[PDB]
Amino acid sequence: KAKELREKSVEELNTELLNLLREQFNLRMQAASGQLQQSHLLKQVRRDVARVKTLLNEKAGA
Amino acid sequence: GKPRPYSPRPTSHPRPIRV
Amino acid sequence: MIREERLLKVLRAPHVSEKASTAMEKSNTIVLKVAKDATKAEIKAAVQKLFEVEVEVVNTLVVKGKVKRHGQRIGRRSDWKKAYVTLKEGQNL
Amino acid sequence: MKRTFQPSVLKRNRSHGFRARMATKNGRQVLARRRAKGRARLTVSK
Amino acid sequence: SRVCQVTGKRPVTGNNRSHALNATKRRFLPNLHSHRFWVESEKRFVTLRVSAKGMRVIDKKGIDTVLAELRARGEKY
Amino acid sequence: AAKIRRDDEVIVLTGKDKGKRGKVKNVLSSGKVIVEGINLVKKHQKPVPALNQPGGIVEKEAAIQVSNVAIFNAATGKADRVGFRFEDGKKVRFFKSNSETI
RNA sequence: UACGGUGCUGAAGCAACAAAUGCCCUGCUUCCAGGAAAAGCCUCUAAGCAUCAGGUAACAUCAAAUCGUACCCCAAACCG
RNA sequence: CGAAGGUGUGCUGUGAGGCAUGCUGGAGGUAUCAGAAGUGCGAAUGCUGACAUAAGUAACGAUAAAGCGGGUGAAAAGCCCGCUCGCCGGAAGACCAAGGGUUCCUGUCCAACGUUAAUCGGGGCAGGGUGAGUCGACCCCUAAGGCGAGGCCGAAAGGCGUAGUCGAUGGGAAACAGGUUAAUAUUCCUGUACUUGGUGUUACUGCGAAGGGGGGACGGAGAAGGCUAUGUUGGCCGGGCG
RNA sequence: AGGACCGAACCGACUAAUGUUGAAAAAUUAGCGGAUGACUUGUGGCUGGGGGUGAAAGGCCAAUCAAACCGGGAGAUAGCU
RNA sequence: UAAGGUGAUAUGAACCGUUAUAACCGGCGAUUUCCGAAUGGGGAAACCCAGUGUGUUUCGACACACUAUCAUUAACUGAAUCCAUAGGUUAAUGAGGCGAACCGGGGGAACUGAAACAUCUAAGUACCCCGAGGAAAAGAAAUCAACCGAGAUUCCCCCAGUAGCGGCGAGCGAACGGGGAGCAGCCCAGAGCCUGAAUCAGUGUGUGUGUUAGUGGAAGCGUCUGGAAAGGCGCGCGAUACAGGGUGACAGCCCCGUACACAAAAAUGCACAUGCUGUGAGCUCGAUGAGUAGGGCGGGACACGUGGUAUCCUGUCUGAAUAUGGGGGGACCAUCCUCCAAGGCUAAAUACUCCUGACUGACCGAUAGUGAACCAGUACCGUGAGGGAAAGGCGAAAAGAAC
Ligand SMILES: *[C@H]1O[C@H](CO)[C@H](O)[C@H](O)[C@H]1NC(C)=O
Ligand SMILES: [Mg+2]
Ligand SMILES: [Mg+2]
Ligand SMILES: [Mg+2]
Ligand SMILES: [Mg+2]
Ligand SMILES: [Mg+2]
Ligand SMILES: [Mg+2]
Ligand SMILES: [Mg+2]
Ligand SMILES: [Mg+2]
Ligand SMILES: [Mg+2]
Ligand SMILES: [Mg+2]
Ligand SMILES: [Mg+2]
Ligand SMILES: [Mg+2]
Ligand SMILES: [Mg+2]
Ligand SMILES: [Mg+2]
Ligand SMILES: [Mg+2]
Ligand SMILES: [Mg+2]
Ligand SMILES: [Mg+2]
Ligand SMILES: [Mg+2]
Ligand SMILES: [Mg+2]
Ligand SMILES: [Mg+2]
Ligand SMILES: [Mg+2]
Ligand SMILES: [Mg+2]
Ligand SMILES: [Mg+2]
Ligand SMILES: [Mg+2]
Ligand SMILES: [Mg+2]
Ligand SMILES: [Mg+2]
Ligand SMILES: [Mg+2]
Ligand SMILES: [Mg+2]
Ligand SMILES: [Mg+2]
Ligand SMILES: [Mg+2]
Ligand SMILES: [Mg+2]
Ligand SMILES: [Mg+2]
Ligand SMILES: [Mg+2]
Ligand SMILES: [Mg+2]
Ligand SMILES: [Mg+2]
Ligand SMILES: [Mg+2]
Ligand SMILES: [Mg+2]
Ligand SMILES: [Mg+2]
Ligand SMILES: [Mg+2]
Ligand SMILES: [Mg+2]
Ligand SMILES: [Mg+2]
Ligand SMILES: [Mg+2]
Ligand SMILES: [Mg+2]
Ligand SMILES: [Mg+2]
Ligand SMILES: [Mg+2]
Ligand SMILES: [Mg+2]
Ligand SMILES: [Mg+2]
Ligand SMILES: [Mg+2]
Ligand SMILES: [Mg+2]
Ligand SMILES: [Mg+2]
Ligand SMILES: [Mg+2]
Ligand SMILES: [Mg+2]
Ligand SMILES: [Mg+2]
Ligand SMILES: [Mg+2]
Ligand SMILES: [Mg+2]
Ligand SMILES: [Mg+2]
Ligand SMILES: [Mg+2]
Ligand SMILES: [Mg+2]
Ligand SMILES: [Mg+2]
Ligand SMILES: [Mg+2]
Ligand SMILES: [Mg+2]
Ligand SMILES: [Mg+2]
């Protein structure tokens, strides 16, 4: 996901961040409720948000 | 061993004075 | 107007207890664990946008973490914020 | 009997607190000594 | 502080010596005087805190030259 | 690199189970390896209510120091030492006293 | 009645007298030892602004955040 | 095929000592001849740890005081429930500030803690619990006092202080009764209120400050009248006939 | 009217007994003095060690005072034990 | 670099990876809350409250940036007051705080010793303060010497516990000269000629060589005792590797290493090379540091306590000659010798170790060694500064004792 998301534009990567943050809220809700056996999903999305925010800074200039 | 000694505490009787 | 990015970081969990259960069936109120820096306005914006329900008033309090002992080594649980979120007449969560 | 320690958090902080220490060079030397010794609590502030 | 602006003379420490040669610490203070000097460049009076010795240096070098030295060292007058 | 790896067929050089041959099931970071049917121990398993209903004196394999097992050459029919070479880019493992890649 | 406590209904609900150290009272009387400050508030204009800003009133709508709130507190929880 | 160390035994030298070996122990030890010393302990009211003694002695912390039945339990003088008795009641009741900080409530446990036992607890463990436009803080405002741009002063460090800026123990907007939780409530609910500011609309219009004036705004003591909180009695209503 | 009188709260501390390895490193009990004042008390502030403060006792300045406490000079020095 | 991974107590859960995007290691980036110099104002540190300007607004509001102080410089502005100056605003650049020791400077004890004590000592020590650097300081003779000469400074060994100083007590204590380490000389006080030519500094760009990950790395079996072999016994083998560590008892050959040989995409240190920018060499002529030297008074520093006391520093009052001149040669004078103050710069030998790597010990081995082998500057004590512990070992393996 380090080369795939790098092909995307800033106008295609912000919406992607607004899909992950939303997914992270849904997983955080499911986890607290008692549902979700797949606890590893929490880390995948948290690290995926990091990747996307990292590329946003690279696209900006820094 | 021995514990740290106490600071002065009230005394019941005056030491007798011999003079 | 508050960013959706901020509105997705203020609701941590639904709070499960007898008082939360009673509040949800008596005073149509949902008890949420929320971010410690979240405001009543941010809670009232997030619930409306993420649960698609109509919010009347948010009441908040800060729960002070307990001092617990784990193998004669003193520790302290983190303080967290509790939101009593009152919905309208007929909405349901 | 009234004992010597009569607690007041305001007086404690004003007399011995972090900002009181920082206000004078001698107070800053207290902090320097305590950091050098490696105190977990520099002042009463905590 | 008790510092001559011209020369830089300041309090120095020495001893009082009695007949029996008892040494007690004393200070030697400069002969400081606040004096209004007339400059023939800035048609103005300049108030310098100066030693009696510093006033003799101004009489010898001239106020213009001495004020130039103060600006060089970066001392406001 | 590691001279002994997972799936490798090894022989035990020292211990109660000396001469016995087995496959390494896993390698621990503490320089120890689990070899199937080698360093057997009789564990007294406590009765758990949640996961695994019964107790019973369970027979399982204990870790053995990696320096207590040698790679089994198969050809010679005895313990051998592992060396390292470069045969077209990749780092491979070879036996000592014959010189054949694994 | 799970003997802890829930559900349901509901009479009279007035008067007289007494009465504070509380209220009227930041009063009144009197005395000498002669009894904070500043803002909110009210009012006045100056520079300035001129059928604009702003002011007043009514009506409508919106906002009032944040932190404390448990519990002990003449005491087994504070200082000893 | 058993090192050091430990513990017996035998032998041995003038002594400090030495040698051998049973048992314990389970991995070190070290001849000889030299070399170097943190090199030898009974005392120092020595230092640290351990353990004695007095001694199963004194004491168990207000002389307000208990008794019994039932319950739970392995066990009940102490816990729970009931009846009685006694004690406080300008407090030994109730609500706070300060200070403490979970001690609150529930379930569970009784090693240690509780001067006894403990099923109990402010003890252990786990879960719960603190809801505000109106209460308080924050906030606006100042007091003593603090800090203090420039400034004045001082060997250095620094000291003092102006403009300022902080600083409550004082001044400054507004909510009440009833109901509710195991544990919060002027905060939740019900009923009925109130305050301040923003925006918009409509009408009418001199608005505007860091400045001026008013106000805020103040002592001790004493006295009297009018009141209410509150109490008492009667009436009223419900129940009672011992 | 009052540094007026009697007397609770409140402030104090004259006497006695108790206690003295205490219930308590200054108290308890019974009496006792002041109790509108040179009164008492909450909160905060200021004064710093040869210095403070003292209706003055060398009193008090964190259970320490004819020179606080803490660290340093420091292993002061000790013709003494 | 890799077949294993998701730090520890600490399992489990859900997973990731196995020929390369798992994890791990290194270079370079990104992110980097709040407090703290803390810097937008305030404050009882980790909190409270703003202004300004952008951009976004679902009109409820939201996001990001900037706003300390002082110094210097520049622009604009600007009093009493005519010019002006002070003052004000804005911008740019720098500073601020922290840190073991070493270093230079500003201040500076007393106990103690003198068998009392005051001169003296302790000691320019402790301590406080300011400032700097990787070192600092010092430094290119107004120096010594002795009629012969030496040739900046610093450090070491001698000279020597000598000469001296000294209530001539207690004590203090040189220099000359010699042997070493190291070695380096320059610039301004100025005008012209000629030209930017020597050389130290940034600046990229190549070249080697270090550093920050790593790679390969020899050779052993049988038997005996035993729980286990690395031990005994037998017979082999490697050695530029028998340093060291680990492995069920003591292993050159089981493992990790070790000798030895290799390694860098990226960043960076040092040393050469080569462009660019600033810097200005060389030659001739001239100049040669004044409230200064010296003096009187009071102190201080010189081993040197005022003494017969040179020399240095200066708080105070004075005050030359300035090369045909001036300083010194230990009172002072003459002679002779020697040097040129009152401007500055300068590497090396020297000092130190908070911190990093390797290696070493007739150093300690749990009351020792750090206070701390252990979740220690912790618990605990104190209002505070500050004080300040105790506490290591099952086993080879948890096989940590089912029933
Ligand atoms: C106790 O002795 C001290 C001296 O150590 C005093 O003298 C004190 O006053 C004595 N007290 C009694 C009650 O005699
Ligand atoms: Mg002893
Ligand atoms: Mg509400
Ligand atoms: Mg609240
Ligand atoms: Mg009264
Ligand atoms: Mg309450
Ligand atoms: Mg009590
Ligand atoms: Mg030994
Ligand atoms: Mg030997
Ligand atoms: Mg000894
Ligand atoms: Mg002994
Ligand atoms: Mg003896
Ligand atoms: Mg005893
Ligand atoms: Mg007896
Ligand atoms: Mg008896
Ligand atoms: Mg008895
Ligand atoms: Mg009792
Ligand atoms: Mg009973
Ligand atoms: Mg029992
Ligand atoms: Mg009883
Ligand atoms: Mg009862
Ligand atoms: Mg607790
Ligand atoms: Mg309770
Ligand atoms: Mg007990
Ligand atoms: Mg409890
Ligand atoms: Mg003031
Ligand atoms: Mg200033
Ligand atoms: Mg000031
Ligand atoms: Mg204010
Ligand atoms: Mg107040
Ligand atoms: Mg309650
Ligand atoms: Mg009434
Ligand atoms: Mg009276
Ligand atoms: Mg008294
Ligand atoms: Mg009494
Ligand atoms: Mg009287
Ligand atoms: Mg009376
Ligand atoms: Mg006397
Ligand atoms: Mg005292
Ligand atoms: Mg004294
Ligand atoms: Mg000394
Ligand atoms: Mg001593
Ligand atoms: Mg600030
Ligand atoms: Mg700030
Ligand atoms: Mg403010
Ligand atoms: Mg600095
Ligand atoms: Mg003496
Ligand atoms: Mg003596
Ligand atoms: Mg230098
Ligand atoms: Mg000559
Ligand atoms: Mg390798
Ligand atoms: Mg090898
Ligand atoms: Mg063998
Ligand atoms: Mg062994
Ligand atoms: Mg000259
Ligand atoms: Mg002179
Ligand atoms: Mg002279
Ligand atoms: Mg001279
Ligand atoms: Mg001379
Ligand atoms: Mg001579
Ligand atoms: Mg130790
Ligand atoms: Mg031991
Ligand atoms: Mg404390």
Side-chain angles (χ1 to χ4, degrees), chain A residues 5 14 19 43 55 59:
Chain A
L5 277 68
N14 287 303
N19 292 359
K43 183 180 289 189
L55 272 87
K59 293 295 184 179

Side-chain angles (χ1 to χ4, degrees), chain B residues 4-19:
Chain B
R4 284 283 186 291
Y6 300 113
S7 60
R9 307 293 153 102
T11 41
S12 315
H13 71 110
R15 174 196 57 218
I17 299 176
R18 302 263 267 175
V19 279

